[PDB]
Design a protein around this nucleic acid. Structure first.
Lengths: 194, 195, 836, 456
RNA sequence: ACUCUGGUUUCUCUUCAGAUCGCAUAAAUCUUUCGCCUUUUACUAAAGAUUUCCGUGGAGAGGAACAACUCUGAGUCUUAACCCAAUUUUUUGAGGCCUUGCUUUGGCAAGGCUA
């Protein structure tokens, strides 16, 4: 019943603000809904030919799609009233889910591209000159030396961070069964192809 | 200085954007100049000419279409040299204007029923329907027939290109048929024979 | 805040810091952490990220930094010594590099924020280059280190490898851009911070060793910090650090002592909050209440790290030990930015940074009021003290010692110390500080220089901002109601004031033009212009880039022009410049101020130019650094040099005007070399005035350019795309439709995301980001910046080309269509006859 | 240095030199160092090299320029100042200068001022321009133009330049620009016979909360009230300046006597019982006034006894029956009725009459067509004044000097003003830019809307 | 390791609700624009303003249950084996004498003498 998504980059120009802008612009997102024209039914829809609208001065490279007019509304159309600015971008959540629980929680799986250490590449960085004067006291140790690096709950707990709202929070308030739409996240996504 | 000559300018909204008059700076200025010149030579006390009730259309390098509304017909002339690849005679309401001296076709008048005449016919149908409480079916249909042929025999060629009029004729015909049906019985028939 | 006011008077305890980096790298979140440190009543919400600097509603709705926000706070260091930090939160989006440039001018050092999961992104490299070229101290703050733990799940050794790789790449970039050896950045030197602004993690080696010292004791944290990095393994047997690993599985000192504890702290909370978390907190000395252990995992991580790491002292140590104070950094600042230089009497006076002396305040940013009616200039006080109610002389950008007309006398109103959402109203501000100034709005457009109204006549202005990018995207604007044109013009001047890189100009056809860097930049400009300021409906034309004109071959005819009195004749030809010469001229590699000997030596050595031709250079480009060369090739035996030199200034001015406004369109002329072959000059000085030579010089420049085979040059964007492995094909498909070719697609080390580098035309880049994100389901994000000018395919002057009304033209028809439609929009004639 | 050697003086054409436009560069949209070309009349950027003015000079061969700020003439292609007494007239048109000697005798001279175009005109009778039917603003400004004390106060820029202004205040734009417009109107050497107040209109629009816009006309009385209040407020400085020029000229004092009336259904005995309560007793309120609002009687609803509709006629003293102790005027609010009496206490030196021609009925807004018969040369208000204030006010005779007349329907309103040229008995009707000599008898036959009277 | 601090659950009631009352989402009425139009009752779909309904939070009050069980916070958060001092006080070599100035005298001020 849940969603495989880890961030809201999938809902780019396909979120509540984007649909509000669409409806206010009397424009239809290809996968989005359609509404009747807003109160500005005949505001500038039938604007006649003009020296400012002259198609002879317009250079055509790629047609200005509705997505362009919704992503940058104040730039790509006139009269953007009751228009909501959609969220621009969130950094790509790069969480790597683990299929086999036997593998360590902190692990360099093949999905991660290897890091070139390049120690042979010429690179000189400051060194302490092997000064024997500084010696750590015998009673100092790295923090949490006794505690292990990871437990059996570490991977599952990390996976709970990148989870939908009911499962990313450890405590909440009870809701009546009516208020839980189990399929609301299904039609909020794009309709599958074919 | 602010280029406001385009604000109050009137053009025929009946035609598409690329079909009506294009509102360039030079030609809008020329049209307003022509109207001002014509209005100047008429004394205000004797008569007057209002810009709002007037329509001024130009034809230049920046306007391939000439627009005017004469006797309820909205005509748009388009020379064969401008935007016209070749002539199609399949369209009924297009007049093949022909150069008399050279005996050759040079332009095409695209006819269309004026919106004022549309509104006049619709109001006539509304008046017929309203005065039908005691009117017999024969008199209602006779008034319909008279008004309809008065419209059609006038705009015989211009109705076909006028898609808004075709939908209006059907709507008015269905309205008077519904009037007769509800005069017959209160409940609407599921299907009522045209015979 | 009395201690804050008293701290302003000590220039040694002041840090002017600019936070810079790529888009969404934690700069704003870091400033939020600092404010939360200094303001107990301001606390971030559990789920909604506090954005204290993002005060604009556009920034809040878009979630992207747009304008720089100054923050002045008192931040204690490791030793508890409080300082006064002037922090600029520059936007990270590449389209808003103007705000970064404005911030760098009034700053002495740079804190570069880099995402830990991401590598060194496009804006990171660009801002590194800009900060190095602006002569500022560079310090790195590798942010979002939590990603390597809770998101990438890398082992601590691999996290160290990723951090080391980031540091190495930054060091390589700095070495490539700079020459100074002491610019090496390393956490051992204290130049690098590792931080997680989301979970309030911030530490250097020094601060974390200080944590050890405060916990264990009898440890020299300064000496211990010098061992907590690099391949310096720790030997538990001898309790000493060795460059050789004592055991086979021995870890680095950084991994063992820093990365392992961090991983364990971030792993006992996200997974083991229920059991073994109180034990770990007791082992760390952290105590949390019953109601604080009930928080969700992310607020719990933030609280635990705030308890364990406490205040932000490693960042303060970085900015104190490496970013110079205004007194220390004043001399390079004056040497770089001031026109007169440090040699002048004021230049010597500026280096002292005396709070009492000649007031010279340089403002690079202008912030609007709530209603938008009034603007407050913001800048650094480089000498003297400004006061409220004090009249000032407000120099412009064209102000010189001769004209003295660009300046204007104004009365300084209320003064403020700006901290994002609130401002501390002050009565005076000493030198070396940042101040909000009111009552100075009218004479200030873009940058400005403020001096005392009387007593200072040597005062020149500071050099205007040299932005890292050129605004090439052009949009036309007209009001819906033509009667409201004055309101739109007022809005245009307001947005010109509020945007450093904005350029509002009027074409000969009356079309108002706005120049921008990208889609987001112009979208924000238009949103401002509509909502604030003008408060009227405005129509926007389809965006169109600005072109440049060049010649691909030498002119086949010796073009000539004559003055109206026909007493002067100039013969000139135009040929293309050598490859890379225009770029060198634009990049200020060679200047007009150079003596002729060094210029000739450079041109002969690096370009194989003849000594006679190299020493005959007269002027450069439309402007001082314009990419055009005027060479006096007249034979001395034929034309007298002294007679010719009498009109040298006039012909140079005509050349500059002609290269500014090209023949083909009203566009800049680029990459063209002009040779003066024959120049008949009248002897009487009345007939050889400027009003005669300048139009003749412009006409001969036009004729020489037209006869030489002309071409249109269009701007090309450089695009960096963050996409996974499976989305690279979609990026290729999208770039193919827009005349874009890919130069590099390399995987990011330490991340599964790829980086595709490609060049796209700026006129085919409209909607490119939207198409890329739609076709890849939002998994491919791209940033575009102007890189270079490229010749448009086809022949611009081919009159046989037929342009369709609403159809894209083929490649051979691109140049002709571009020139015709540019001329139509400009309001010029239909085509340019070669005769003119 | 080579002044007086300029050969481009003859190139200057004074016909196209209109300084009524906003001083902004034609390309850079910058108000700083705006240079006005004396050949084409356009404004440009600056004198230096690579400036818009410098490029324009070497492009159209326009070699003469004027600095709109420093009132200096420059030849940018050569970059040398032009100093000559022949061009002093242009600077006077751009920035008129009025001395005390010229101001004092400005009301005692009668000569046709000579304009460059060849059309004669007079100072102070110049008609303003209309921009999208803003005739109300022009009428109000001309009404204030005919006022000598306000004009003299605004003819000297130094009279208000050195006052204290709040840092966030914008009301001062209504003072300096108004003074500039006053100087332009009374310019004896103006190039044209008309003045177009573009900058003044922008100041009015900006200072107002988008009220009284240029595009849409507004009520004359409301605009005049706002203008007077803003002038009083702006000139008040960073303090409460009780005695300003506007206050000393137009502001007077009247006493309001209010007697609350009980509900009509209340019995007479209970009404008398409530008469003991101070709520329904007379209450004295002494409040100063900027103008006097005269309310016309209701227009006739039928025809006369001779089956011919007659234009209503009312004497001036009949609508002046207000503001005295005898007349009691009922105020029907939405809740309760009041009997508000008015008693004049302090006649201002100049009195402003605002006849309420436009009242909104239960469904729409109607205009009262009642015609007021008023002598324009001798009216005495000593009778309306109290016996206590008639001793101090030894002067009560008022002479009409201006009369704003509204004609037509409220929607298609047209504003015209009949100004009185001081020093002559002639009356001038100012309709937009048109100035027409109107006989004194014809003024009283028009629908008077706003009137100004001088004590003298 | 000291002493005082004094709950949780549940059922009602009265009020206040900013806040996603509600990570959910209905209906009715009115006024505008339409769509159907031929009249109710249903409606078409946008906007605006209301009301009702299904629920919710805080605070206050009154009963009941586990009322007896402990918290947290504050309070000073209160102890001896063997080992120690050149930067602030139980190990710290810091003593005395004289000169002359000066204070009403006492003394003070500076310098010199050491061992």
């Amino acid at each position: 019943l849940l969603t495989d998504l880890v961030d809201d980059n999938y809902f780019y120009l396909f979120d509540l603000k984007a649909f509000f802008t669409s409806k206010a612009l009397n424009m239809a997102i290809p996968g989005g809904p359609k509404f009747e024209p807003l109160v500005r039914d005949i505001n500038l829809q039938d604007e006649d030919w003009n020296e400012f609208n002259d198609i002879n001065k317009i250079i055509i490279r790629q047609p200005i799609r509705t997505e362009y007019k919704i992503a940058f509304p104040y730039l790509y159309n006139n009269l953007p009233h009751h228009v909501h600015l959609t969220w621009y971008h969130t950094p790509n959540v790069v969480f790597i889910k683990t299929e086999d629980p036997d593998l360590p929680a902190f692990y360099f799986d093949p999905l991660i591209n290897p890091i070139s250490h390049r120690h042979s590449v010429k690179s000189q960085e400051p060194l302490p000159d092997d000064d024997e004067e500084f010696e750590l006291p015998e009673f100092v140790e790295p923090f949490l030396k006794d505690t292990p690096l990871y437990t059996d709950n570490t991977a599952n707990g990390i996976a709970l961070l990148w989870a939908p709202r009911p499962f990313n929070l450890r405590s909440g308030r009870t809701r009546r069964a009516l208020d839980i739409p189990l399929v609301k996240n299904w039609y909020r996504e794009h309709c599958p192809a074919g | 200085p602010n280029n406001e000559n385009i604000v109050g300018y009137n053009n025929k909204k009946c035609w598409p954007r690329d079909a009506r008059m294009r509102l360039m700076k030079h030609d809008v200025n020329l049209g307003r100049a022509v109207f001002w010149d014509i209005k100047n030579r008429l004394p205000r006390s004797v008569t007057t000419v209002q810009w709002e009730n007037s329509f001024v259309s130009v034809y230049s390098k920046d306007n391939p279409n000439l627009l005017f509304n004469m006797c309820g017909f909205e005509c748009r002339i388009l020379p064969k040299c401008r935007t016209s690849y070749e002539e199609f005679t399949h369209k009924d309401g297009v007049w093949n204007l022909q150069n008399e001296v050279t005996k050759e076709r040079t332009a095409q008048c695209f006819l269309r029923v004026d919106d004022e005449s549309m509104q006049r016919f619709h109001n006539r149908v509304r008046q017929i329907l309203m005065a039908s409480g005691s009117t017999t079916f024969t008199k209602i249909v006779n008034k319909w027939n008279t008004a309809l042929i008065g419209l059609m025999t006038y705009f015989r060629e211009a109705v076909v290109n006028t898609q808004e009029l075709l939908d209006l004729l059907v709507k008015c015909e269905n309205k008077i048929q519904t009037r007769i049906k509800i005069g017959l019985n209160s409940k609407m028939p599921s299907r009522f024979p045209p015979v | 805040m009395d201690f804050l006011a008293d701290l302003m008077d000590n220039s040694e305890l002041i840090r002017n810091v600019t936070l810079c980096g790529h888009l969404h790298h934690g700069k704003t979140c870091f400033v939020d952490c600092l404010i939360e440190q200094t303001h107990p009543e301001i606390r971030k919400r559990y789920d909604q990220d506090l954005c204290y600097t993002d005060i604009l509603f556009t920034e809040q709705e878009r979630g992207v930094g747009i304008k720089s926000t100054p923050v002045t706070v008192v931040l204690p260091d490791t030793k508890g010594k409080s300082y006064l930090f002037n922090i600029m939160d520059t936007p990270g989006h590449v389209n808003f590099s103007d705000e970064v440039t404005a911030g760098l001018r009034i700053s002495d050092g740079v804190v570069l924020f880099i995402d830990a999961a991401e590598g060194v992104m496009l804006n990171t490299e660009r801002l590194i280059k800009h900060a190095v070229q602006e002569r500022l101290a560079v310090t790195v703050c590798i942010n979002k280190i939590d990603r390597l733990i809770l998101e990438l799940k890398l082992p601590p050794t691999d996290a160290y490898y990723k951090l080391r790789h980031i540091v190495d790449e930054v060091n390589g970039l700095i070495s490539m851009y700079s020459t100074d050896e002491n610019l090496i950045l390393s956490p051992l030197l204290g130049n690098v911070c590792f931080s997680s602004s989301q979970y309030s993690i911030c530490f250097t080696l020094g601060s974390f060793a200080k944590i050890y010292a405060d916990t264990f004791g009898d440890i020299n944290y300064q000496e211990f910090a010098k061992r907590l990095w690099g391949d310096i393994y720790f030997n538990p047997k001898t309790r000493k650090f060795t460059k050789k690993a004592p055991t086979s599985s021995s870890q680095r000192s950084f991994v063992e002592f820093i990365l392992e504890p961090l991983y364990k702290i971030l792993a006992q909370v996200v997974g083991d909050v229920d059991t073994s978390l109180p034990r770990t907190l007791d082992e760390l000395g952290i105590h949390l209440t019953k109601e604080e252990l009930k928080l969700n995992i992310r607020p719990l991580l933030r609280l635990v790290c705030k308890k364990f790491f406490g205040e932000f002292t490693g960042f303060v140590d970085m900015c104190v030990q490496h970013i110079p104070s205004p007194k220390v950094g004043a001399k390079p600042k004056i040497e770089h930015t001031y026109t007169g230089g440090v040699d002048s009497d004021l230049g010597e006076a500026m280096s002292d940074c005396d709070p009492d002396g000649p007031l010279m305040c340089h403002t690079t940013k202008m912030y609007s009021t709530d209603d938008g009616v009034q603007f407050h200039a913001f800048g650094r006080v480089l000498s003297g003290t400004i006061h409220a109610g004090q009249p000032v002389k407000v120099l412009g950008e064209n102000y010189t010692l001769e004209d003295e007309e660009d300046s204007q006398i104004c009365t300084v109103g209320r003064l403020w110390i700006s901290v994002a959402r609130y401002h501390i109203e002050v009565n005076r501000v000493p030198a070396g500080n940042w101040v909000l100034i009111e009552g100075v709005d009218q004479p200030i457009v873009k940058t400005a220089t403020i001096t005392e109204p009387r007593g200072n006549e040597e005062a020149q202005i500071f050099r205007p901002l040299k932005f890292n990018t050129t605004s090439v995207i052009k949009i036309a604007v007209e009001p819906v109601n033509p009667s409201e044109l004055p309101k739109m013009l007022d809005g245009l001047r307001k947005v010109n004031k509020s945007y450093p890189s904005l350029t509002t100009k009027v074409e000969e056809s009356g079309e108002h033009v706005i120049l921008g860097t990208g889609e987001l930049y112009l979208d924000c400009v238009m949103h401002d212009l509509r909502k604030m300021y003008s408060e009227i409906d405005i129509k926007v034309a389809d965006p169109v880039v600005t072109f440049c004109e060049t010649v691909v071959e030498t002119s086949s005819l010796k073009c000539f022009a004559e003055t109206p009195n026909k007493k002067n004749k100039i013969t000139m030809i135009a040929e293309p410049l050598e490859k890379g010469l225009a770029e060198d001229i634009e990049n200020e590699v060679v200047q007009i101020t150079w003596n002729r000997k060094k210029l000739g030596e450079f041109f002969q050595t690096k370009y194989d130019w003849d000594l006679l031709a190299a020493r005959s250079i007269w002027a450069f480009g439309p402007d001082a650094t314009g990419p055009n060369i005027l060479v006096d090739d007249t034979l001395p035996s034929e034309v007298d040099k002294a007679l010719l030199g009498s009109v040298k200034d006039s012909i140079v001015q005509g050349f500059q005007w002609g290269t500014r406004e090209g023949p083909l369109c009203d566009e800049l002329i680029r990459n063209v070399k002009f040779k003066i072959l024959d120049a008949v000059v009248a002897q009487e000085p009345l007939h050889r005035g400027g009003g005669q030579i300048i139009p003749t010089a412009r006409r001969v420049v036009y004729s020489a350019f037209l006869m030489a085979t002309p071409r249109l040059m269009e701007p090309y964007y450089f695009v960096e795309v963050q996409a996974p492995a499976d989305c690279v094909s979609a990026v290729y498909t999208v770039l193919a439709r827009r005349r874009g070719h890919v130069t590099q697609d390399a995987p990011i080390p330490g991340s599964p995301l790829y980086t595709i580098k490609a060049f796209i035309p700026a006129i085919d880049s409209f909607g490119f980001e939207t198409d890329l994100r739609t076709h890849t389901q939002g998994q491919a994000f791209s940033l575009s910046v102007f890189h270079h000018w490229q010749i448009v395919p086809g022949d611009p002057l081919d009159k046989s080309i037929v342009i369709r009304p609403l159809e894209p033209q083929p490649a051979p028809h691109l140049a002709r269509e571009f020139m015709i439609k540019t001329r139509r929009r400009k309001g010029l004639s239909e085509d340019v006859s070669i005769s003119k | 240095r080579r002044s007086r050697h300029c050969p481009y003086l003859d190139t200057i054409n004074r016909s196209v030199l209109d300084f009524d436009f906003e001083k902004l560069c034609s390309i850079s949209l910058s108000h700083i160092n705006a240079y006005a070309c004396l050949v084409c009349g356009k404004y440009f950027q600056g004198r230096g090299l690579k400036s818009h003015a410098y490029i324009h000079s070497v492009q159209f061969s326009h070699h003469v320029f004027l600095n709109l700020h420093t009132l200096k003439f420059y030849c940018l292609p050569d970059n040398y100042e032009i100093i000559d007494s022949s061009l002093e007239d242009i600077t006077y048109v751009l920035k008129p200068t009025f001395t005390k000697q010229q101001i004092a005798n400005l009301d005692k001279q009668a000569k046709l001022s000579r304009a460059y175009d060849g059309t004669t005109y007079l100072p102070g009778i110049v008609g303003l321009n209309n921009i999208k039917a803003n005739d109300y603003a022009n009428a109000v400004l001309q009404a204030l133009s005919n006022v000598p004390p306000l004009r003299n106060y605004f003819l000297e820029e130094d009279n208000y330049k050195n006052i204290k202004r709040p840092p966030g205040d914008i009301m001062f734009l209504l003072v300096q620009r108004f003074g500039e417009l006053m100087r332009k109107l009374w310019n004896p050497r103006n190039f044209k016979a008309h003045v177009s107040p573009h900058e003044m209109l922008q100041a009015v629009v900006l200072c107002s909360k988008k009220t009284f816009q240029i595009t849409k006309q507004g009520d004359g009385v409301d605009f005049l009230s706002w203008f007077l209040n803003a002038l009083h407020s702006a000139l008040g400085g960073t303090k409460k300046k009780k005695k300003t020029i506007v206050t000393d000229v137009f502001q007077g004092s009247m006493r309001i006597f209010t007697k609350k009336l009980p509900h009509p259904d209340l019995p007479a005995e209970e009404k008398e019982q409530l008469l003991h309560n101070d709520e329904y007793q007379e209450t004295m309120v002494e409040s100063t006034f900027m103008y006097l609002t005269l309310d016309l009687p209701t227009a006739p609803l039928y025809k006369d006894e001779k089956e011919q509709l007659i234009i209503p006629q009312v004497p001036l003293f009949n609508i002046l029956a207000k503001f005295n102790g005898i007349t009691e005027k009922e105020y029907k609010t939405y809740k309760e009725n009041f009997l508000k009496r008015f008693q004049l206490t302090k006649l201002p030196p100049y009195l402003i009459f605002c006849i309420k021609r436009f009242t909104k009925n239960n469904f729409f807004v109607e205009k009262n067509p009642t015609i007021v018969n008023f002598p324009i040369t001798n009216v005495d208000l000593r009778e309306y004044l109290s016996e206590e204030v008639q001793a101090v006010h030894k002067n009560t005779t008022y002479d009409l000097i201006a009369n704003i007349v509204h004609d037509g329907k409220p929607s298609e309103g047209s504003y015209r003003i009949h100004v009185l040229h001081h020093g002559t008995g002639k009356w001038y009707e100012l309709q937009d830019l048109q100035v027409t000599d109107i006989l004194p008898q014809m003024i009283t036959l028009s629908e008077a809307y706003i009137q100004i009277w001088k004590r003298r």
